Write a protein that binds this ligand. Structure first.
Ligand SMILES: O=C(O)CCc1ccccc1
Length: 126
């Protein structure tokens, strides 16, 4: 069901949260080799999450579930805000700019925290 597809998407999102916090610890400790690997792992988790969200939104549209489509249009827009901040973070790492990396990391944390009440609303709406 689309609802169980959203639970699968939610779990992939939680996996990225877990890997992100582990990446943050490694960054603070200066373990750049670990950070590089965690960033690759996160890039894969976001690409997976983004595609699953796209399938869920498309399915909601085909089902005519207007409220779920509204919420998923907002949530996918916000996901892209997080994604853009991720890609800038990756570039900051490549460039050795730890000041920008710290900035983009905190912003990504606050954008994600903000998007959580909506994430829970979608589960109920599908
Ligand atoms: O953290 C997010 O909100 C998603 C970030 C993301 C999404 C898709 C590709 C790269 C990063």
């Amino acid at each position: 069901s689309v609802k169980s597809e959203y639970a699968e998407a939610a779990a992939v999102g939680q996996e990225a949260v877990a890997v992100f916090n582990t990446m943050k610890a490694a960054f603070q400790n200066g373990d750049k080799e670990a950070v590089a690997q965690y960033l690759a792992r996160l890039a894969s988790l976001y690409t997976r999450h983004e595609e699953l969200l796209n399938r869920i939104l498309e399915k909601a549209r085909r089902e005519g579930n207007k409220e779920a489509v509204t919420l998923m249009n907002e949530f996918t827009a916000t996901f892209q805000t997080g994604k853009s901040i991720f890609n800038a973070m990756v570039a900051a790492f490549k460039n050795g700019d730890d000041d920008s990396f710290e900035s983009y990391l905190q912003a990504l944390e606050k954008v994600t925290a903000k998007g959580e009440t909506l994430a829970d609303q979608i589960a109920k709406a599908l």
